[PDB]
């Protein structure tokens, strides 16, 4: 089977460029898009991660993919955009993974309390 049974690469692993407040490659990274964590493989900072329950606002412009992470992060205390050539694709994939995973590491926030 291989409709969208994608490998760890080609689609989900996107070599991005960590660029901050200038679009300046301040450490061009990866953005490993998974179910719930956006695993950015930095230069020297190692695989940074962005859990989906943190991406306030995530985007895409001309090879620029972004997300406003609403927690503290390894290297992204807020709107942290990367110059991702597959920004479109990445952002998309992300928004789509967002839609299609519902995103839970574990421990559901008691779905429908009614107590």
């Amino acid at each position: 089977s291989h409709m969208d049974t994608v490998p760890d690469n080609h689609r989900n692993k996107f070599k991005v460029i960590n660029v901050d407040d200038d679009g300046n490659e301040l450490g061009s990274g990866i953005m490993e898009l998974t179910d719930t964590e956006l695993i950015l493989y930095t230069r020297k900072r190692d695989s940074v991660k962005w859990h989906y329950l943190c991406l306030r606002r995530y985007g895409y412009d001309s090879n620029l993919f972004s997300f406003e992470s609403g927690r503290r992060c390894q290297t992204g205390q807020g709107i942290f955009a990367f110059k991702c050539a597959r920004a479109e694709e990445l952002f998309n994939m992300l928004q789509e993974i967002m839609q299609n995973n519902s995103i839970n590491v574990v421990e559901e926030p008691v779905v429908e309390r009614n107590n």
Binding site: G59, D61, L64, S66, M98, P109
Partner: peptide, 23 residues
């Protein structure tokens, strides 16, 4: 607005997550 991250080279027109709205 902030919903575009204007990261120097490029302004990123971002969107908000359905995770906070689909828990």
């Amino acid at each position: 607005g902030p919903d575009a991250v204007i990261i120097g080279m490029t302004k990123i027109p971002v969107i908000e997550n359905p995770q906070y709205f689909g828990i």
